[PDB]
Amino acid sequence: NKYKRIFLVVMDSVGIGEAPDAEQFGDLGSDTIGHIAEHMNGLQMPNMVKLGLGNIREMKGISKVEKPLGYYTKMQEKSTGKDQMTGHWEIMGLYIDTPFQVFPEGFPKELLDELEEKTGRKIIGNKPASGTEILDELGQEQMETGSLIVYTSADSVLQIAAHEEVVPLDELYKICKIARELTLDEKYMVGRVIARPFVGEPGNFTRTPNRHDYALKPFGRTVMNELKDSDYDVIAIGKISDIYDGEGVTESLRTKSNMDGMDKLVDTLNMDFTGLSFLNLVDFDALFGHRRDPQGYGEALQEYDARLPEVFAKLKEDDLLLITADHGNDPIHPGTDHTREYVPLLAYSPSMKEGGQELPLRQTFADIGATVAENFGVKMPEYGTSFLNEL
Numbered sequence: 391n392k393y394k395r396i397f398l399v400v401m402d403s404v405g406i407g408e409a410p411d412a413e414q415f416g417d418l419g420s421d422t423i424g425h426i427a428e429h430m431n432g433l434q435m436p437n438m439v440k441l442g443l444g445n446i447r448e449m450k451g452i453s454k455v456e457k458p459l460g461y462y463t464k465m466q467e468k469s470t471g472k473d474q475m476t477g478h479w480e481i482m483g484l485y486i487d488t489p490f491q492v493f494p495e496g497f498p499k500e501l502l503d504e505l506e507e508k509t510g511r512k513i514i515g516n517k518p519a520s521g522t523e524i525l526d527e528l529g530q531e532q533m534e535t536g537s538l539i540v541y542t543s544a545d546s547v548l549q550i551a552a553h554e555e556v557v558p559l560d561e562l563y564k565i566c567k568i569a570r571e572l573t574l575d576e577k578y579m580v581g582r583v584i585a586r587p588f589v590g591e592p593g594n595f596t597r598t599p600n601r602h603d604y605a606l607k608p609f610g611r612t613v614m615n616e617l618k619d620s621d622y623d624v625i626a627i628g629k630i631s632d633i634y635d636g637e638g639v640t641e642s643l644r645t646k647s648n649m650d651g652m653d654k655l656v657d658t659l660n661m662d663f664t665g666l667s668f669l670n671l672v673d674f675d676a677l678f679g680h681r682r683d684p685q686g687y688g689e690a691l692q693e694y695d696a697r698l699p700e701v702f703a704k705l706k707e708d709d710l711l712l713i714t715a716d717h718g719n720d721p722i723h724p725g726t727d728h729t730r731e732y733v734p735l736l737a738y739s740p741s742m743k744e745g746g747q748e749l750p751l752r753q754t755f756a757d758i759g760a761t762v763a764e765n766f767g768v769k770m771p772e773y774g775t776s777f778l779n780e781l
């Protein structure tokens with residue numbers, strides 16, 4: 391095998407400019423890194439610059455270098471949707487025709503009617519909200535009536551909140567499983583159904599750790615599945631395991647923040663493994679993109695960049711580092727949804743003694759999965775073209 395270990399880092403939502411099909415999505419003008427760079431009066435990301443970020447595209451504070459450490463290009467999304475599961479499933483070798491939906495005005499009456507019909511319970515709420523806001527507003531009514539608080543967020547989720555002393559946990563989980571079946575429908579396709587049990591009294595409600603998530607499996611066996619089946623390590627860091635519903639995962643490391651995610655990446659550098667370490671840095675999307683906070687996003691990018699030199703120092707001759715993103719989420723863009731954007735691709739190994747070069751543009755995110763598959767000699771994905779031989 392060419393590389394013993396591959397470290398794949400998804401900077402979640404870190405897009406590099408509108409894709410050719412952005413107009414279909416209402417995403418003309420979208421530019422996640424570029425708009426952040428402008429807001430920051432120049433982004434400080436010297437380590438990404440050294441890798442060749444500016445060679446992909448020059449932006450404020452992000453300039454090209456004569457001799458990038460590794461290889462660079464961008465990738466274009468081939469699948470229909472710009473959601474979390476589409477982008478990640480494509481990266482690992484799939485093609486997803488049917489996109490996951492978001493619900494800024496709440497769920498269609500038809501879906502909620504059927505959920506009521508199957509459960510024998512009333513549904514209240516039906517809007518995007520934080521768990522705190524919705525409990526303050528409807529927690530007391532929920533307790534008194536035994537109704538279900540159904541709500542969403544900026545991502546593809548259907549959340550069901552019920553008080554633990556009013557709706558037994560087991561009943562709440564049964565209800566969520568019913569909701570999970572009903573939402574396997576392209577009209578209502580949510581990425582995740584989430585049980586949100588809570589306790590307390592009006593003016594003092596708290597969500598309990600008895601939260602359960604109900605995800606869909608990827609629409610195909612992924613490169614991760616093939617790695618696991620061939621006895622390779624597949625270490626998932628952060629949201630990765632959840633995003634693939636555990637498919638192909640041999641070890642999962644939970645993270646609490648981007649800095650904690652980098653700490654776990656460092657932990658995996660310290661592990662003797664053969665296979666894939668796969669990190670998702672989610673704060674970019676979860677705290678800043680959807681909340682349209684370019685300052686916070688910019689600060690987070692600078693915090694991430696400052697962590698990289700330690701990563702560079704630990705990489706071995708037979709390690710490969712891949713840095714990419716799944717979609718965009720431009721923090722200076724209308725609405726609260728993701729943006730359809732190209733994503734950067736940086737590919738670096740200390741064995742690249744003369745530095746890297748420009749790669750042909752990746753026509754699908756599955757090019758990453760294809761590269762990983764070829765490296766480890768496992769079954770090649772149906773989609774994607776390996777760039778292993780170019781490195």
Ligand SMILES: O=P([O-])(O)O[C@H]1O[C@H](COP(=O)(O)O)[C@@H](O)[C@H](O)[C@H]1O
Binds near residue numbers: 521522543544546547
């Ligand atoms: O908590 P996480 O990282 O699993 O994230 C979870 O909860 C968030 C809601 O946050 P709130 O608690 O403010 O309602 C949602 O945006 C997200 O889709 C969901 O996976």
Ligand SMILES: [Mn+2]
Binds near residue numbers: 415416418723725728
């Ligand atoms: Mn848009």
Ligand SMILES: [Mn+2]
Binds near residue numbers: 403
């Ligand atoms: Mn994402």
Ligand SMILES: [Mn+2]
Binds near residue numbers: 675680719
């Ligand atoms: Mn998102």
